[PDB]
Ligand binder design. Sequence first.
Ligand SMILES: C[S@@+](CC[C@H](N)C(=O)[O-])C[C@H]1O[C@@H](n2cnc3c(N)ncnc32)[C@H](O)[C@@H]1O
Ligand SMILES: Nc1csc2nccnc12
Ligand SMILES: Nc1csc2nccnc12
Ligand code: NA
Length: 256
Amino acid sequence: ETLGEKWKKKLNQLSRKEFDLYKKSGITEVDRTEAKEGLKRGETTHHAVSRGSAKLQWFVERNMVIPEGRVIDLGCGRGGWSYYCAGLKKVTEVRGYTKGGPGHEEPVPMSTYGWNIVKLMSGKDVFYLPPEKCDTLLCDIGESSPSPTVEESRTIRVLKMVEPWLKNNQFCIKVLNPYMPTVIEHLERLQRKHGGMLVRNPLSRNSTHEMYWISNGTGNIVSSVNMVSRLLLNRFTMTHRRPTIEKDVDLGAGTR
Ligand SMILES: C[S@@+](CC[C@H](N)C(=O)[O-])C[C@H]1O[C@@H](n2cnc3c(N)ncnc32)[C@H](O)[C@@H]1O
Ligand SMILES: Nc1csc2nccnc12
Ligand SMILES: Nc1csc2nccnc12
Ligand code: NA
């Protein structure tokens, strides 16, 4: 039994009150107050549509993924990763795909900096899309489940779906459940072929063990995964630590 599976069993036993106190304990988060108020008013400039823009920003500012050329954003939801990439000088086109419909986020139209190079398309299930030529492949798909075997299936499905899109390109891919042994086996195979490394984002909630496979890095996947399991298990042992609260991103305005 992995450290991650022990964390999962403990998470599943939490009452709603305990879960609500645990999920943000000691994490980092952006203050969404101003963006939520502006989005409620129908403002289309400056605001990030979701917490996703700051989340991807964290990796990009650390050179973990360096978006460039034609960017594909799989599972774009409202479009946070797409609108953030649209403002980056090396980026020339952003194509976002998302499922939409009941239970799923629809793309939000915005006029943030670089909006003219963005096309967000809903009604697109990526498990039925043929791969396209691109210079950057982003993917933020992985639905949490109380069942780690359901999450293992969903993670493996994402890893097999993204591979044909990977052609010596920059990438940032969510790995919903990176601790299940079958997932580690696929990740090690993928890293041997395409390189990169698995990284824990400090903006991720403690309620998910997600890590992101990024193109610009090296390291031992197993070691990185167990470090997150230990961190997340340690966060059950202490009173809630209020999160580090940072300013949200300003995505500006205008065409590129
Ligand atoms: C974690 S959210 C992405 C948030 C986004 N990165 C942002 O910055 O706003 C993942 C999205 O993937 C979508 N999704 C889930 N399964 C999908 C699939 N089979 N095909 C396409 N989109 C999918 C969900 O509806 C959801 O909006
Ligand atoms: N998704 C959930 C809603 S309540 C709950 N409690 C334990 C595990 N998962 C859940
Ligand atoms: N109470 C909970 C324990 S685990 C979980 N996952 C999602 C929503 N609620 C819960
Ligand atoms: Na929804």
